[model samples]
Target chain A: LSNVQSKCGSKDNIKHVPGGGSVQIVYKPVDLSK
Target chain B: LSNVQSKCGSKDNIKHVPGGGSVQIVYKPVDLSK
Candidate 1:
């Protein structure tokens, strides 16, 4: 996850997959309408 | 992020970090209305 974190350039708003294998990150505030 | 790939258990719907450092994964269909 750290690898992706650094790659993402921001260490925030990260949601981990079950069992700590993968993650989902939102770099910016999501605009659902967009 | 092979490490995370293995960790994730399922290698699907993965979004890579711009520089190939990290990744974002979606395991299921998102419900934007939710």
Candidate 2:
């Protein structure tokens, strides 16, 4: 089985796991689209 | 060192790595934000 989690952040960052793999994170940027 | 890769997909999916960890994927949806 596999498990995945999603959460919101303030900025983009990545965390390397202790043993292997990594976490891909993305955040919502302040909308300057005008 | 660790590496994280992000790419465009058609939908949200998760792929468990061979040994450990997983890949969290998110794709662009048909924007109907109106």
Candidate 3:
């Protein structure tokens, strides 16, 4: 199984992947209209 | 009052919001010591 690379915090975190790949996690205000 | 219709080159300028909402602005080599 693939372990979680990172844990979720109160905010977001950016990760720089290998081979010039990157990821951005944006956390906006929760929309309760679901 | 959205007047400025995309005016920022040499770096970042991407906007798409209408029947579709898509925007991606990417730039590099920009880091000030301020």
Candidate 4:
């Protein structure tokens, strides 16, 4: 199985996680399989 | 160094990485910091 996440705008400016489930607001996206 | 990235919507619709660099499409989010 695979999981995904996304965010926009500045890292310190993210205030909402629009969708449900576990969400995170960060400076960028990353791969879990490194 | 620390790098982070994020994306939204279906895994197939992400066409641009506004900031540039390698990007990926998936159903959910993963922790690269892990």
| TM-score against truth, every candidate | 0.15, 0.22, 0.16, 0.15
Runs in model 1 deviating more than 4 A are: A1-20, A29-34, B1-22, B25-34
What share of the reference contacts survives in each candidate?
0.08, 0.10, 0.00, 0.16
Question: What fraction of the reference structure's interface contacts does model 2 contain?
Answer: 0.10
Q: What is each predicted model's overall lDDT from 0 to 1?
A: 0.41, 0.44, 0.35, 0.42
Q: Rank the candidates by TM-score, best first.
A: 2, 3, 1, 4
Instruction: Report the C-alpha lDDT of model 2 over B1-34, residue by residue, as the tens digit.
Output: 4444333332333333345677665544343333
Which number leads on DockQ? 4
Ranked candidates, highest lDDT first: 2, 4, 1, 3
Pick by TM-score: which candidate is best?
A: 2
Q: In model 4, how large is the Cα lDDT of residue B23?
A: 34
**Per-residue lDDT tens digits of candidate 1, residues B1-34?**
2333123323444544433244685444343553
Worst 10 residues of 4 chain A by lDDT: A9-18
Q: How close is candidate 1 to the true structure, as a TM-score?
A: 0.15
Candidate 2 residue spans exceeding 4 A from truth: A1-19, B1-21, B25-34
Better model by lDDT, 1 or 4? 4
Kindly report which residue pairs in candidate 1 clash with one another.
Answer: A4-B22, A21-B7, A21-B8
- Candidate topping lDDT: 2
Model 3 C-alpha lDDT per residue in residues A1-34, reported as the tens digit of each score: 2333332332233333334334454434333332
Predicted candidate 3 versus true structure: per-residue lDDT over B1-34, tens digit per residue = 2333332322223343334234444433333333
The stretch of ten residues in a row with the least summed lDDT in candidate 3 chain B is B3-12
Residue-pair clashes per candidate, as listed? 3, 0, 0, 12
**Looking at model 4 chain B, which ten-residue stretch has the lowest summed lDDT?**
B12-21
